[PDB]
Every structure is written in C-alpha cells, then in structure tokens.
Symmetry: C3
Amino acid sequence: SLNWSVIVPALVIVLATVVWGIGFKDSFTNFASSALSAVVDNLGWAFILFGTVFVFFIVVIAASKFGTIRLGRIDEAPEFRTVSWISMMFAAGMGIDLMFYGTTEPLTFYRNGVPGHDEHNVGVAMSTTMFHWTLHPWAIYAIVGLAIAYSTFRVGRKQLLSSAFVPLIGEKGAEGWLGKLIDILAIIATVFGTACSLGLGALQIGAGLSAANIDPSDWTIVGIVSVLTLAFIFSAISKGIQYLSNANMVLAALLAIFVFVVGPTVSILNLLPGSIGNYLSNFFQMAGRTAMSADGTAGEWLGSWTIFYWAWWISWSPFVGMFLARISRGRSIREFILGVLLVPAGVSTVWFSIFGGTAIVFEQNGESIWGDGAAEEQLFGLLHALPGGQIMGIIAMILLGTFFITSADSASTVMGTMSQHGQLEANKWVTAAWGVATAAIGLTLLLSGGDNALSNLQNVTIVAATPFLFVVIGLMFALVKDLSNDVIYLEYREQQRFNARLARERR
Amino acid sequence: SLNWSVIVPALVIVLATVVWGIGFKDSFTNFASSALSAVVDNLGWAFILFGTVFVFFIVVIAASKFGTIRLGRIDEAPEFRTVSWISMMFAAGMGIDLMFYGTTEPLTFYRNGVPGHDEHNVGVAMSTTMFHWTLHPWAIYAIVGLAIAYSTFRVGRKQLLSSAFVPLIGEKGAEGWLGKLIDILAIIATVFGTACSLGLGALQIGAGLSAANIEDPSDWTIVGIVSVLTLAFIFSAISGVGKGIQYLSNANMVLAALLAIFVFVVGPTVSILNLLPGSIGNYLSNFFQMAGRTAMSADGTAGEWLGSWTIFYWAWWISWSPFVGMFLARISRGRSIREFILGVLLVPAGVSTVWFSIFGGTAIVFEQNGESIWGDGAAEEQLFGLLHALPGGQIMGIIAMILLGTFFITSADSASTVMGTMSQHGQLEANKWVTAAWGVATAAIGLTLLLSGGDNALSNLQNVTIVAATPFLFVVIGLMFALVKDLSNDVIYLEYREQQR
Amino acid sequence: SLNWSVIVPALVIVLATVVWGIGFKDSFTNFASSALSAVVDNLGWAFILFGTVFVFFIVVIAASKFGTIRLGRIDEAPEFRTVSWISMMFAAGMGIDLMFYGTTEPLTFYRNGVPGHDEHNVGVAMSTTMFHWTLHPWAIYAIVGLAIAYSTFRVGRKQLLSSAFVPLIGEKGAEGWLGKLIDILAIIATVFGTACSLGLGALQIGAGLSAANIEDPSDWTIVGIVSVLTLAFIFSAISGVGKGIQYLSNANMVLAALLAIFVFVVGPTVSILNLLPGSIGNYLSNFFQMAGRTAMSADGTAGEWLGSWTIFYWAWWISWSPFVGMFLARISRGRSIREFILGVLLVPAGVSTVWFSIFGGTAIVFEQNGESIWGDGAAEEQLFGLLHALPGGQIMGIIAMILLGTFFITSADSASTVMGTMSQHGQLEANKWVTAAWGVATAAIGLTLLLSGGDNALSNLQNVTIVAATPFLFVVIGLMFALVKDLSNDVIYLEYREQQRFNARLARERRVHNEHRKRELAAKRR
Ligand SMILES: CCCCCCCCCCCCCCCCCC(=O)O[C@@H](COC(=O)CCCCCCCCCCCCCCC)COP(=O)(O)OC[C@H](O)CO
Ligand SMILES: C[N+](C)(C)CCO
Ligand SMILES: [Cl-]
Ligand SMILES: [Cl-]
C-alpha cells in the first residue's frame, strides 16, 4: 500500500528540477542558486549553532539515565555481536564522499589556510577536516538514528520520520498537515543528499579516465552515470548491496594500506596523534566560526566549506539514520550513541590522515599534486606520484563505480521504505524508481553549470537541505518527550523518590 | 530589633570616608585612590585565581549529591515563578551600567584589543566581554546566595553573612572577632554599592540629557536627577502595599526587552544572529586562557589592562556579593540548590550574552562598515551614539534614558532592603525606616562631594569600590568551605557519618 | 631464593654495554646515539598518541566503580597513610630531576621559544614545561603502579612486574617467551635509569662546585665525587632494614621546602604568586594543542625540537616506570584505586607546578630585567646562578649541592629496593645482599664515563637508556588491558555488575505484569 499522498508530491519537486533545470532555460536554475546565498546569509547561523547543538544534545542524552534504556522491548539483546555491529558502522563511514574530498580537503586548507590562521598550517588544516567529518555530522546521524530506532523498536511505531514526532504532533492519525509534510521533506532531502555523492562521484570517474584513456568531455558524464545507473537497476533484483558492501571495503583497503607504506609512513603515522589533538584543541574555536570572524570575512569560506557539509549531512540523515537504526536494534541508547560517534570517526580520522595527509607532505617537498586546482583530479594525481600508482587509479575508478551503485541501493531502499508507510519489506520496483529519479537529479546538477558543475551541485543540495534542518532540530524535542515518558526512566524516577522516602520516615 | 553594635562602626566609618573627600580635602582622597594599585598588584593573583575557582565550585557542587537537596522542610512548596529571577537577577545585580557597557566594552576590545592578541578580533572582543559578565560574576553570587539561603531556609539560622560561617567558627561563638567585622564590611560594601549605583546613574544622565535637552552638566543636573530618583525611590519603599521590587523589575525587563528587540531588528539582525554561536563557541574556546590571564602575561605587559579591567571587574563584583547574593535568597524558598545553581548560571548567562551580542555586536558591525559610533571615546556617550544611528533613535533614546531610571530605584531600594534585613539581627522583614534611611545615607555625601566647587570628586568612590571589599574576597573563600564542611553535617551525610564510621 | 635465569641474561648485557662504552670501540657507542633517530622519528608518533591516552585512561578508571576497590584483602587499614606518599613520590620517581631541569626549562623556553610560538612567552614557557613534569608523566606511573599494586596486594601474588600480565598471558603459565623476557627488560631499565641519575650527581657537582672551589677540568677530580658519595651512601649497607628510606622523606621537605619558601619570600613573591593560576590556566588551554605536537607540526619542522624535549621525555619515563611503579606500589596497601590515582596525579603534579612557578618564574623575571642567569648554556650553572643572586646565595647554594646528595641516595636506595626485589622471586623483605649489589651498577660505567681521557663520553648516558626500554612502551600499552581485564574480575565489581542484572530483570517482571493487568482491567470497562 504505497503512500501516494507522499510519493507524487515528492516527484513533483524532483521533476521540477530536471525539467526546469536542464530541458528548458537552464540558465534559470542558476537563479535559484542565488537563493543559496540567500539562505546562508540569514539561515546560515542556524546551521552553525544547531550544528554544535546536535553534538552536545546527543552526548548529554547518552550521558543521562536515558542511555540505559534498551532500544526494543525491555532488556532486549542486540541481534549481532559488538564486533559485527561495529564491522557494519565502518561500511557506513566510507564511500564516494571520502574518495572525492579525501585528498583535496586537507590540502586546500594547507594550500590556502583557514580564515583565522595563516596558510601552510598542518594542525589547523587537519583539525578543520575532522570538524566536518567526525563528531559533528555523526551527532546528527545519531539524532535521526536514535529517533527512528526508538519509535520502531521501543514505542512500536511505523518506520517513518513522522512516527518520531508523535509525542509532539497528531496523533489521532499522525500525518495531518505535518506528517505527510515531514516525510515529504525527508524524501526530497535524501534525493539531493545522495545526488551529491552520485554527482561529485560521477565526475571523479570522468576525471579519473584521464589516467587510462586520453579531455574533460561533457557527454562523458551522461555516460558514466547512465552506465552505472543501469548496473543499479540490474543489481536491483537480489541485495546485492551486501555483496559489493565488502567489495567496496576491500578496494578501499587496498588504496589506504598501499599509500600508508609507499607514502611518507611516519608522517601519516604522526598525523594520527596529531590530528586528534588539534581537533580537540581547535574544536570550540572552530565551533564558533561564523560570518563575523574573521573580521566579517569568513562568510565566504563557510559557504564553500563548513556550511556546505552541514547541509549535506542533514540531507543524508534520513538515510544514514535508518541504516544505523535498523542495525542497532537491541543496543542501549548509550552504547548506540558512543558507538555511533567514535566508530566511524576513527576511520574518517585515519582516511584523511593517509590520503590528504600525504598531499600535505608532498606540498612541502615541492611535488604538489595540485593539478591545476581541481579536486576532481587531485586524487589520481596523488597516486600517479607513487610507484605502480596507475593501476591504483584504475582501482579507484572501479571503486567509485561499485560505490555509485551500493550507495544508490541503500538510498533508494530507505527512500522506498518511507515512500510506502515505513514497510521494512522494500518493494523491489519502487526502489529502482527512486534510484533513477535520484541519479537523474545527480546528473541534472552535474550538467547545468558547465565548468563549475561542482558548484550548483553543492548549492541546491544546500537549499533542499535547509527545510529539513528545522525538522531534525525539532526531532530533538520529540525525542526528549519520547524519552521522559518511557517506562524505564519513569520507573527509575519512582525508585529514587522512593529510595528517598524510605529513609524519610525511618529516622 | 535594630542591632546598634554594627550600625555604629559602619555609620561612623562611612561618615569618615565622605569627610575625607570633601571640604578642600578633595585631593588627599585622590592620592588614597592610587592606593588601590596596591591590592591589584599583590592581590591580583588572588582574584583571578579564585574568581575562576568559584565558577568550578558551584558546578562541582551542583554536580554532586548536595544538588538534589532542596532548601527547606523538603518538598517545601517553592513560591516565586520563573519571572522572579531574570528580573531581580539583572535588576539588582546590574542594569545601570550594563547599558553603557553593553556597547563600550565589546566596542573597546575590538578597537584596541586585549593583551596577547591583535585588534579588531570579533571573537576575542566578544569572549572577553562575555568572560567579565557570566559564569564568573554569578558564581561569586551563587556561593553567597546559596550559603545564606541554606543557613536560613534550611537550618533556620538568621539571615546574616556571619551566620553562614557557623560551620567554620562555632555555635554562636561567631560573636567574637570574626563575625562582627563581617557585618561591618558587608554594610560598608552595600552602602558604597548603592553609592556607586547612584553615581553611575548620574554620569549617565549627563549624556542622556545630551540626547534630549545638552548642556555639559552645569550643576542642577546631578541634584535635579539624583535627588529626583532618590525622592522617587523613597516613595516606592514607604508604601507597604506597594512592593516596587516585584513590579519595577518586571517593567524593567519589559523596557530592556523592548529596547533590545528594537536594535535587534532594525540593526544588523543577522550579524547579531551570527554572533550567538560565535560568542558561545569563542567563549568556550578562550576560557582557560583568559581564565589564566595573569599579570605575568604577556612578557609582563597586561599588568595595567588587567587591573583596569578583569581585576577591577572582580574586586568590584566581590563587593556586590552580599546584596545580590542575599537577594538570590530573599526571593527563593523550596527549590533545590541544583535547580538554583544553574538558575543563576545558565540563565543570567543567556541574557547577558544576548544583550552584548545585540548591542556590542551591532557596534562592531558599525565599526566594520566604517560608520563608527566611538566618537571622542566616552563610555557614557556611546550607547546613545549607536542608538541615534537607527530609525526611531531619539525616541528609543528616551526610553533608554528611562531604563537608567528604572531598576535604579529598585537596585537602590532592593539594595537598601537587604541592608535593613542585615541590620536587624538578620530579619527577613525590616522596618520601613531603616531601609529608606540608608538609601539616602549616601545622598548626604553626594551633595557634599560636589560643594567643593565646580566638579572633581566622585572619581574617588569609583576606585574606592575596589578596596571597599578587598578583604571581602576571603569572606567568599571561607564561605566556600563553610558551605562544604556544613552540608557534610546535613541530614543525609550525618546519618552515614554517625553509623559504622 | 634467587633467579639465576633472569639475572644471568641480565648482567651479561648490562656490562656488554658498560664495558662496551668505556672499552672496546669507545666511539662506537656514538652510533647508538644516532640510532635513536630511528625510534624517535619512527615511533615518536606512538610515543605521543598513547602517552596522552594514558592520561584519559587512568582518569576514567579513577572515576570508575573500580575506583572503590581497595588495594588488598578488603579492609587493610592504610599502611603509611599520607605525606610519606608525596615525599616518596618524587624522592623515588623524580627527586633530583626536579632541579637539574626544573629551574632552567621554564627559562630555556622563555628564551628560545617552543615551536609554534615566538620567544618571551611566559605562557607557553609555563605550559610546555608542565606538559612534561605533571599530568602526563605521573600517568605512566599510576598505570604500572595499579597494575602492580593490584596484582600483589589484592589478588595476593608475587611483586614481580611481569605478574600483572597474567590476565592476558594466563596465570602461572606466563613464564617463557613472554614473562621472563619482561623481567629481563625490567632489571636493565632500572639499572640504566639509576646509573644515569647517579652519574648526574657527579656532573652537576663537578660543574656545580664552581660556586665554591675546583676550577680545574672535570675528570680525575670527580674521583672524589662518585667514589666518596657512594662510599658514604652505603649506610645503608651495615643496616637497613625493611622499610625506610623515610629519613629522606621528611628531609626532602624541610630541605626543598626551605630553599623554595626561601626564593618565594625573597624573590618576586608577587610575580611568582601571579604565575600561579597562570600556570594551570595556560596548561589546560594548551593541553590538547600540546598533545597534538608531532614531527609533522608545525609544517614538518618541530621534529628536532620534540626529539630534544617531548619525545625525549616520554621515551625515558617508560624506561623509568618499572621502578617508580614497583616502589609506588608499596606504602599504598590499604589505599583505594581512586585515592591512589588522585594521589599520584593531583598532588605530585600540583607541586611540580608551584616549583616551576617559583624557580622558573624568578628565573624568567630576572630576564625581563636583564639579570639573566643563563650560564653559557649549562643546566648546572643556571640552578645556582639565580640563588646566589639573592641574600644568602652561598648559604642556600650549600643546600643546592649538599641536599642533592640526599637525592642521590633516595633514588639509589629506593631504586635498588625495586631491582633487588624483582630478582628474588618477587618477595618484599629487605634483602641487604642484593640491595648493595645493584648499588654498584655504575662503578664500571659511571666513573668510567669520565675516565675516558678526561671527559666527553656523552651522550652514551641518555642514549643507551631510552633505547633500552623501547619495547617497554608497548608493555605499558598492553598493560591497560591487563589492568582493566583484571580489575573487572574483582569480586566487589563482579558482584556490582551481577546485581545490576538482577535488579534489571526483576524490574521487568514487576512491569510486564501491570501492562497485563491494566489491560484485562481496561477491557473490563467495556
Ligand atoms: C583539558 C584536559 C585536562 C585533563 C583531562 C582529564 C580526563 C578527562 C576526564 C573524563 C571523565 C570521564 C568519567 C568516566 C566515568 C565512567 C562511568 C562509571 O564509572 O560508571 C560506573 C557504573 O555506572 C553504570 O554502569 C551506569 C551509568 C554509567 C554512566 C555513563 C555516562 C556516559 C559517559 C559519556 C560521556 C562522554 C562521551 C564521549 C564523548 C565526549 C562504573 O562502571 P563501569 O565503568 O565498569 O561501566 C563500564 C561501562 O558499562 C562500559 O562497558
Ligand atoms: C553511508 N554512506 C557511506 C553512504 C554515506 C556516509 O559516508
Ligand atoms: Cl529497558
Ligand atoms: Cl602568556
């Protein structure tokens, strides 16, 4: 029983873009990309504040008595071992994203420096990438994850973001004016979310083909996408996602290990203890970077970096949020939070220490893989400066390929599950539908922009993300009232008032 | 009822100082002002060390078991609602200058920069201000407000600073040396406290009239206002069925809210709005450095800046601890210390942060855009400069002027109320005569400090505020132990104490 | 009994480096000094990363329920009690070091400036010195301290160090590949660690007596230093016997606390008392920015600084942790895990600071004027240089050397107590025989390190030490697990977690029923 009151209203906006953005006008879509600067200008501070708010909030609810509450029936045990549960979070913290921004990210920060420091600054440069990729985003993923994993397993509700707002909203048939709306926002956000990954993931393949066959064609993008958006429909008949799920991790294993030993090992090893310290050291300092610091200048830097990421992450929380939820059944609220923060974070700490960590060492010996200044080639260029690095580049391409599909599967499945009343049992057909409709806008962005295709990709996803921002914000409140009414916290507060009164009349 | 064993030493010393500052004695009270440097130099270490400890202390106390413990007969019906604090918290604690400082400070620290940094640093300029007006000034209040409220609304003892030292001194044996000296210094500091509040309100008016009517305060101004506000306060204190403290404060929040909301919308809204995360994050970051900004840093330079700022800021604060602290109790009963510690922390922080961010932040926004409002550089002229720079300036200016008048009568009467309550053997309710009488006891000096001829006198008291409570610093430190080695003699700890151990 | 299986492979290489340094290829030992530039740069990261983790590690253990477990057969009324602790913390652990680096480190930093900062930074000058002599170092101790203390006094087994590794290598069956090898690497690390401190006395005295007499070189003149101070040392020797030590604990106080309260009241009392919160503050504000200092920061240019300071320290501390944990363990019986961790960290770290605040402070304040104490760049000269600049500079200068004479025996005595204890199957009783034995451990290298044609047998001192116990790092690493995977099996904690379960499920039975009675009842209103 598909939810059409939610499916089509979403497809109305997904098409609006592909139609009005490539077919007709085209130059007009770049008008809404001025509504970008509109949103960062005045809704900008929100992302910054509630950003760091999401990181405290979650730690404190995990630190609280809530943490003990078992996600599922009372004293329910997890379904997999700690090791297997963690062995699944690793696959959650890897994909196109890190492929793209792995090397270029910390390099840019070394190259140009971060608003508030000089250029050529390892400590800062590094601790900024962390800022983006460790605690902060995963704090979000936890908010949405816990909210879903709680309402479904504990309270006993449908697997829908709206079913997490029940404590605040009607109710009496949750999905009146809101609900449908809240879900319609989830859907849209997830599309543009994955869109970026597919998007910047695509043209990182095209730029990568300039390692085998030789330059930056245009019909090539449509090729790389369509070639893989077909393989996605192909491998949309089994799951599937689990086969390649490791096929990805092994390739990602090669790339890393390889560059660990061939590259400046001891440097890369120095970056671990080093880029965990500057992270902590600078955390608050970068927590407060807005468009006032540094002397009303960092406004631009935020738009291109810190505020992009924040939007992106949010527009992905509906996807990642279900994943971690679905997996974590059984875990305690705390075990699930501390788990969700530190686990993926370790990998995002090593990964940037390896790839973009050599890019810094290189730029210190003159080597410089800057390659004309485009990140989309930065990666391969990095490898080409290492022995047998040309085969590695080939691997990387086939890797971003396997990523394109697996990343699209999980996305479409989630977007499917919530496009039809939270049915865990995903309809094989509606899944592929959300993939093509997604890959679609993942292409509609890449094409409409030209030389700065990357730009519009990040501006729209920021736009469609902003609405949800508020959703997730509110998902705190629904999550606190949901917890304060939970048996185990209610029953405990009854035991200390009793463990107080029992000694109030014996004296 | 009127305790005349402490009224005397105070009424005489307070009269001794005013004389040694008037009648051609105006110069020898200035040389005595530079004797302040003595304390800032040798007790510098003292303030900047413990000022930060208190902040950790209440936290470490709210954190532990002592937190759950209400203050009273347990589950004792609270009383005053949420609006009780926010009002008096900023009505008695501050309000007067925190309108001049709401702009001149964040605007100064930007322009000239604080030690160990470079100028035009928005972050620092906000973190330093914030530092001077949050966790710190409210812990050296919480300590007091928590101690007293416990040694009365729990134990039952009488509301008087020495009574809270019972745990350290002895059962009633606090009558000797340590105990009488307390009440004197607590009265001196509260008499000067009001005196300084009356003085600031007067220097403000000068610039207020400059906004409305100017004219380089040609006499009449100090009297025709300080008296107007004294005679306006002496009326809102007499009428029993009036309670100006519970009203004017509420009105005060409404005026300040109005004013704030004005600039916040007409002015650089987003800037203010970007300054919220900007302020907090920065504050958290620059906390442990500016917490340890000793006069040894940097390279020995910050000596002056500290004394003129942070230090003076502390020595000044420590003074208003009796009054403000007592008030954090005279209007609270039944709500656990924990729901109180953060009550006077998380909450005052919020308002101050926001206030500065709005004003101070806007000032920086102006400073950057080239349309400054620093002009000539008088702290007392800047608030209005920023104001008149906005549509409906002169208008909002009038109410801004009124604001300085509001809370004033309260900050003075409520400052005198606590006096009347600490003068009559620590009685919650005090005679309507002793309270208002002390609220004007400073007026008798204010009119003599100007009869010297022309103008050049008040400057004394400004610096005398520091040393006016210099010793009262330690009165806090000990009060910190008298609150730890006292709660461990409470019901829950004494039962496990007198058990197997 | 004696372990002629761990001590045999012991002195065989203890001297295979001693006679190797003084004899054989004299300048071949200067190839190992360029061989640490293989660990310091290749393991420097691993020395930092885990060094910091060490400070979080215990701190949580301290706050953990583990922090209630008492150390030894439940009750065990506190053995020594207090004071003797903080006195034997340093006397044993630090002691002499607090001087031959404690009044010059805040000074060298105020001068040259640490990497990532300009010179003349009172702040970093204080912050970077503490990073080395406070929270970080002691935390390496409290681990081995607990691991060892809990291993012996609680469980009730041997005082041999490798014992604490039975929860990981199996109990009673961890003697072979791993086990004896640990004890071997243990005794060595304690010999060198001690030999270094003993040789320092001669070096600091030879170049320290300059404030009195002996302007000659520094070779045969020192024969009356090493050979005499050790001669007067063993006494001791004639009698022990079982405990103190001690006669040095209250000594160090009266003595140090004297010269300290001396400079604190004579010198710039305020400039010191000011730098009091300034020390702590800046320390906290820079803690994470210091633990992030690597040979990749700043801009891959601080390696030769770190290698001279930070890593230098960390490496050494692990190579000195055996003794200082073996000794820290005693006098701690009947003291809880918590009060032990908050004992080794808070107070020792809380005094080192006020030490650098008085000595490092005035030493700095003297430079802010022009009366520099810097004596041609020599650690010994600076110490006396700043006290002879105060009324009675030769009256306290006396104690500057004569007191350091006590620290000589404090280390040796206490240290020997440990190395002796670990070669006797791990018993506690005072073994006079082995005590004085290892007491030698320097007569073949210490006094010979100088007879090498006059002097210059450096740095064959610091070189051999930090490389000796380079695997020790990975030992104090896996010591965290053997500490926690052991603490957790303790009856008191084993019972704490079981009770949780009970309450847990019982509380479910109470609930699952109501929702089945307020349900049948709810279906009764129909
Ligand atoms: C600026 C730098 C200066 C120096 C910094 C020093 C170091 C920082 C100090 C950090 C303090 C952390 C304190 C940790 C205490 C542990 C909690 C505890 O003792 O719980 C007891 C028992 O309590 C309970 O079991 C129930 C309630 C536990 C409450 C835990 C709260 C969560 C803490 C998370 C906060 C931070 C998370 C990381 C992100 C910042 C003990 O049992 P256990 O430790 O054996 O339990 C182990 C646990 O189950 C793991 O398997
Ligand atoms: C879960 N994904 C890997 C798809 C996104 C996080 O990088
Ligand atoms: Cl549960
Ligand atoms: Cl400094």
